Write a protein that binds this DNA or RNA. Structure first.
Ligand SMILES: [Cl-]
Ligand SMILES: [Cl-]
Ligand SMILES: [Cl-]
Ligand SMILES: [Cl-]
Ligand SMILES: [Cl-]
Ligand SMILES: [Cl-]
Ligand SMILES: [Cl-]
Ligand SMILES: [Cl-]
Length: 302
RNA sequence: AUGUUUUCUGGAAAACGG
RNA sequence: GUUUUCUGUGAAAACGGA
């Protein structure tokens, strides 16, 4: 076209403004005291900003890299927004409330492990049992050992495996889930998905505490989280931030960032992606400037 | 990072088959 | 080609020396 240069100039201006947030004080948490002048931008955010800033927008290859970098920055931004907004003291309560609202339940690390191993004792041979019969089998063995357990709560553990698509009036375990390691993984993954859909962001260390009551299942939880990551993850995470914000009313109007974030999520990150037009380059960089500006402002004020 | 872990990603050997 | 044992390389991600 002949607007190519003009698009370049706007794109360059966006990147210039973003680069200012990497300067030692521009993103300070608070200027009241030297001890609080640390940047609000996490190490991943700073890495991803440096990567974008380094893109040569005067070369096609540089423009392709800038779009990938804009997408990566925007996806991390949603996570940072959720994390800053998130109330650590209400986290476990919001998690179990989300689980229980779906008629599911996590009885606790020792009780849940036992419930699942009992389900396997009944079903690992391929038997197809009615729900009432399976629940009864589990309750008769579990309840004397864990008096807090009940027929109602075991039914909820069974519903969680059901909602996790582990089965198939009659319940039969899929062949792939007829071992404890496989069944437990799918169970754990379902809880993580419930948490994410509730707008929660929980790290592998805390997941290990919540689901296992120790710190020796971090890599396992990290594995689960990573297998849930797809190209659709960024767009869904935008909708999940919305849930998190509605839990408290969104006084900062973070919801205004939605269209910009959704534009970024629509960026095709694959290497077989056609280079961006100049228009797409400008729009993408405006969007990522707007959201990073949004994040920094949110943290510095809240 | 000559640090920890995770996701995706391609060769050796053993036995068998044809 | 099937099954088993053992193992490459690269890209990316989280944690993180801070
Ligand atoms: Cl340039
Ligand atoms: Cl470049
Ligand atoms: Cl919260
Ligand atoms: Cl829910
Ligand atoms: Cl629960
Ligand atoms: Cl327990
Ligand atoms: Cl713990
Ligand atoms: Cl671990």
């Amino acid at each position: 076209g002949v607007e190519d240069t003009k698009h370049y100039e706007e794109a360059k201006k966006c990147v210039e403004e973003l680069a200012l947030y990497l300067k030692p004080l521009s993103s300070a948490r608070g200027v009241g005291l030297n001890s609080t002048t640390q940047s609000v931008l996490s190490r991943p955010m700073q890495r991803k900003l440096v990567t974008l800033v380094h893109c040569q927008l005067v070369e096609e290859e540089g423009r392709i890299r800038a779009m990938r970098a804009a997408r990566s920055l925007g996806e991390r931004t949603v996570t940072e927004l959720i994390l800053q907004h998130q109330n650590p003291q209400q986290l476990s309560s919001n998690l179990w409330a989300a689980v229980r609202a779906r008629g599911c339940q996590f009885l606790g690390p020792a009780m849940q492990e036992e419930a699942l191993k009992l389900v396997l004792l009944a079903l690992e041979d391929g038997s197809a049992l009615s729900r009432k019969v399976l629940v009864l089998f589990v309750v008769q063995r579990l309840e004397p050992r864990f008096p807090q357990a009940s027929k109602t709560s075991i039914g909820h553990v069974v519903q969680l495996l059901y909602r996790a698509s582990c089965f198939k009036s009659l319940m039969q375990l899929k062949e792939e889930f007829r071992t404890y390691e496989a069944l437990r993984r799918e169970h754990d993954s379902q809880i993580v998905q419930i948490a994410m859909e509730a707008g929660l962001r929980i790290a592998p260390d805390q997941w290990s505490s919540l689901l296992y009551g120790d710190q020796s299942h971090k890599s396992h939880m990290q594995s689960i989280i990573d297998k849930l990551q797809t190209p659709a993850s960024f767009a869904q995470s935008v909708q999940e931030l919305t849930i998190a914000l509605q839990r408290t009313g969104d006084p900062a109007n973070l919801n205004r960032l939605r269209p910009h974030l959704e534009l970024l999520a629509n960026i095709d990150p694959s290497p077989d992606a056609p280079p961006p037009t100049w228009e797409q380059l400008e729009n993408g960089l405006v969007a990522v400037r707007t959201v990073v500006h949004g994040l920094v402002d949110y943290i510095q004020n809240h």
